[PDB]
From a paper:
Here, we have developed a cell-free protein crystallization (CFPC) method, which involves direct protein crystallization using cell-free protein synthesis. We have succeeded in determining crystal structures of two types of proteins with high-resolution using CFPC. The polyhedra crystal (PhC) produced in insect cells by infection of cypovirus (cytoplasmic polyhedrosis virus, CPV) is one of the most highly studied in-cell protein crystals. The structure of crystalline inclusion protein A (CipA), a bacterial in-cell crystal, had not been previously reported.
We have succeeded in crystallization and structure determination of nano-sized polyhedra crystal (PhC) at a high resolution of 1.80 Å. A 20 μL reaction mixture containing 10 μL of WEPRO®7240 and 10 μL of the mRNA solution was overlaid with a 200 μL SUB-AMIX® SGC solution in a 1.5 mL microtube and then incubated at 20 °C for 24 h. The crystals prepared from the CFPC reaction (PhC_CF) have the same cubic morphology as that of PhC synthesized in insect cells (PhC_IC). The average size of PhC_CF (580 nm) is approximately one-fifth of that of PhC_IC (2700 nm) as determined by scanning electron microscopy (SEM). To collect diffraction data from the nano-sized PhC_CFs, the crystals isolated from the reaction mixture were diffracted using the micro-X-ray beam of the BL32XU beamline equipped with Serial Synchrotron Rotation Crystallography (SS-ROX) at SPring-8. The root mean square deviation (RMSD) value of the Cα atoms for the structure from PhC_IC is 0.09 Å. The main difference between PhC_CF20°C/24h and PhC_IC is that PhC_CF20°C/24h shows no electron density of nucleotide triphosphates (NTPs) bound to the monomer interface, which are observed in PhC_IC. The average B-factor values per residues of all atoms in PhC_CF20°C/24h show a large value for His76 because of the lack of cytosine triphosphate (CTP) interacting with His76 in PhC_IC. In PhC_IC, the amino acid residues surrounding guanine triphosphate (GTP) and adenosine triphosphate (ATP) interact with the NTPs, but in PhC_CF20°C/24h, which lacks these electron densities, there is no significant difference in the side chain conformation between PhC_CF20°C/24h and PhC_IC. These results indicate that the NTP binding is not essential for the crystallization of PhM.
Numbering used by the authors:
A (entry chain A): 52 to 150
B (entry chain A), C (entry chain A), D (entry chain A): 2 to 248
Amino acid sequence: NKNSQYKVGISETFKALKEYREGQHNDSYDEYEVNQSIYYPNGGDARKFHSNAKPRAIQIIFSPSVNVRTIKMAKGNAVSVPDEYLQRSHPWEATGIKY
Amino acid sequence: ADVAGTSNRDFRGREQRLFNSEQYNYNNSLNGEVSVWVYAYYSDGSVLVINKNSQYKVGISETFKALKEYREGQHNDSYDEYEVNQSIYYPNGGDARKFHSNAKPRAIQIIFSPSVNVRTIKMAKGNAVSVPDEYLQRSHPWEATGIKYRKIKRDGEIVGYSHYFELPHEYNSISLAVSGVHKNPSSYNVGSAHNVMDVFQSCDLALRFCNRYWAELELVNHYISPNAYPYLDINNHSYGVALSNRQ
Amino acid sequence: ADVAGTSNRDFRGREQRLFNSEQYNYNNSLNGEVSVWVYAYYSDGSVLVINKNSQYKVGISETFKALKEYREGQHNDSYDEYEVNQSIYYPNGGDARKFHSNAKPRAIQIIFSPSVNVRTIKMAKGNAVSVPDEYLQRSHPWEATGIKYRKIKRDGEIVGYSHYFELPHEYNSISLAVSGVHKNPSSYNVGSAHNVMDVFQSCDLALRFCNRYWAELELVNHYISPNAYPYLDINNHSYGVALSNRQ
Amino acid sequence: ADVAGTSNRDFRGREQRLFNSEQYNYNNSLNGEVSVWVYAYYSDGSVLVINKNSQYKVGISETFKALKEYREGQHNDSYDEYEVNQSIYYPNGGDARKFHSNAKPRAIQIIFSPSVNVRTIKMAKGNAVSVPDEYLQRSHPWEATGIKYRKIKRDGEIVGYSHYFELPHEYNSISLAVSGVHKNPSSYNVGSAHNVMDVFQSCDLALRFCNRYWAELELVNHYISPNAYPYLDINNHSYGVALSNRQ
Ligand SMILES: [Cl-]
Ligand SMILES: [Cl-]
Ligand SMILES: [Cl-]
C-alpha cells in the first residue's frame, strides 16, 4: 500500500513480488536458482519446474480520490523491460478503461 | 515478382530496415526509455548489476553497505561484515577478524542507454557514510562526469555510454548515486507545467532490476546479449546491436 | 538370396513382425502382466508416480497423507503438514500457518495397461478420512468407472487406458484406491479352485514402484519412454509403442 | 395437509425413518462396508488410530515397531529407539539409555463395525519378532477372540464391537494383526468361483487411515463423532448413532 498527496505509485521487481514467509524456511538458495532460470531460459540449476512463490494473480486497487484517466501501469518481463526490448518499449500503458 | 536483393521492389528488405530504424528512433523520442546500469565487480569474479528503466530521467542511489557482495542462500560472514562496516565508517570503529572484506567492490562500471543526453549525467560518489566531499558543509551534491563517458560502438553506431573506475586501494570505500536525463533536442520542456505531473508519475513507473552473476561471461551471455543491452568487458570489447538504417 | 523388402523370403522382416506381435499377444495371455499407474500432479510441476505390475489383477490404495508431495532429502514443513492434516480431517481441527498446502495434489491420472479388461476397473475415491461416500453406513466400497477411460492410441493401436480428474478446489481432499482385472475372454476362471492359490501368490509377487519426478518432461523422457509405457500429457499427446503386426 | 406428528400421512416422518433404516441395512448387505479400527494408547495420553474399510472382509497387521508412538514433525529419540528395539527383540540385545520406552503402547482397543460377523474375528497377537506363540513350529497363526468382544450400544442398538486389553507390564511387547469377515447370512459364498475375483479386487480397493490424536477427548470430538463411528472411552461410555427404524 502507498498513501500520498497529489499522486501515488508502487514499483516492484520480479523477485520482490515472490512469496516471502517471515521467520520460516524459503528455499532461499533454490529460489536464487529459480530467478536465474526465469531471467534467461535454462539460465539456472533449480530443483523444481514451478516456484510456488510466483504470484498466481495481481489485484490493483485505487482509492476513489484517483482520477481513473491518469492511471498508468508498467507490467514488465522478469528483467524489468516493459515490452520485450527497451528500444521499442513505451514505459507504461494507460489501463483506466479496465478498472 | 522482382528477385530478392536486385531492385527497389524488395519490400521485405525495406520493411526490415524500417523496423530497426523505428526502434532506434522511438528510444530517442520523448515517448522512449532512458536506462542506467551500475556494475559492481567483486574479487571472486562475480558482478552485481543494478538497472533502472524510466521515461524522461533515470538514476540509481546505493549505500556503501548495499554495494557489498551478497550471496543469496549462502553464508556471508553477516556478523563479521557488520563489524567491517563499523571499521569503514570510522577508523578502528569495529572489531572485525579481517583486514580487507572481499565483499567490497573492486570496480564500478556505469552504463547509460544511447537515449541519454551525456551533458545531463551527474554522479554523487560519496564516502562510506554517504557524504559527497569530506563534509556536508563543503559538498556540491554531484559532479557532471559526462566528459569521461566513452562511446560503446558496434558497426559505427553508438549503442551506449560507459564510465569505468577501479577501487583497487584499501581506502576506496564508496556510496554511489548516478542520474541522467533523456535526450530532448526540442523546446518542449518535459518538466514544464503541462507535463510535470507525467514526470512525477515516471518516478513511480520506473522499473528496477538487480542480480549477482557469477562471472563476466555469464553476465555477457545471459544478461547483456539476450536483452540487446550495451556493454564493455574487461578486454575493452564492445557489445550491443546497431539498429539505425540497418537490416 | 532374394533382395530385402521385395519378396515373401524376407525372413528378417517376418521375424521382426512376429517378435512385436508375440510381445503384444503374450501381455494379453493369462501368463501376462496387468499394470496400473497413479500419477499425482503437484502445483510445483512435480509428479508422483505409483506403479504396480501383477498377474491376473492389480491395484493401488493410498491414504490422503501418502498422496501429498514428499521431497526426499529436502525440507517438507513436516510439523505444519501434520497440522494441515488435522485441519483437513475435521474443519478447524488443526493449527496450521497456511490456508492451502502446496503438497496437495492438483490432479490424478490413472492409467491401465492394454491387458486390463476396462469393464472390471473399480475405483474407491474417498474423503480425507478414507470413507468412500460421506459415511461408511451408506458407502458402496467402489464405483465402476470404465466408461470414463479414454483409449491411449499410437499408429491406430490401443497402448493403454486413461482416466484423468482435476482437484482444483480447496475441498478436493481425497484418499484413493483403484483396481483392475487382466483380460480373460476364456471360460477358465483364473480364480476357480484349480488356480485360486496362484492368484493368492500373485498378490505377494506383485512388484511396486514409486518416485517423484520434477516435471512432466522428465517423467516422459526418463520414466514413460524408456520402459515403453503408455501416457497422456497435459497437451493431450499420446505416448507408447504399437506392437500388433508391426515392424 | 394433515398436521405434523398426528397421522400416518406424515410422509416427511416416514421418509426420515426409512432414510436411517436404509443406511443401517445397506451396511449389512453384501454390497456394504466392513470396518476395523485399532487404537494404540500411549502414556502421554495420545492415541494412534489405524482404520481399514473394505467390502467382504477387512484386517490390519502391524509390527512391534509400527505400533510405537511417532510424533510427526517433533524429536522422537530415533537413535535410542532403534537401541530400544534391539533390547526388546532379544534380552540385553541393545544399548539404550532408558529402562522403559514411553513410545510403547499401554493398551489396545480393537473395534469392528456392526456389519462384521463376530464368529469370524481372528487375532494374531505376536511377540516383538512377530511370532504368534513363542516359536513358529508350535504357533497357530491366530486365535478366534469373538467371545471377548463387547457390544457397543446406543438407544438399544449394537453400533459396534469392542475388544480391549491393557499392556501395563514391562514384558507386554507385541506385534498385532486382526481380521473379520462381513456378515453373510445367505448361502451365496462371496468367495465362490462366481465372485472370488471381486474379493481379490476388494483387497486392492480397501481404504486405510492412520493418525495420532493428542487425547481421547480429541479422538472422540474430531474422529469418532464427525464420522458416526462407534467407540468405548476409558470411562466405559458408548459412542455411535442408532439408525434401525429410528428418526
Ligand atoms: Cl517525441
Ligand atoms: Cl493363456
Ligand atoms: Cl446383498
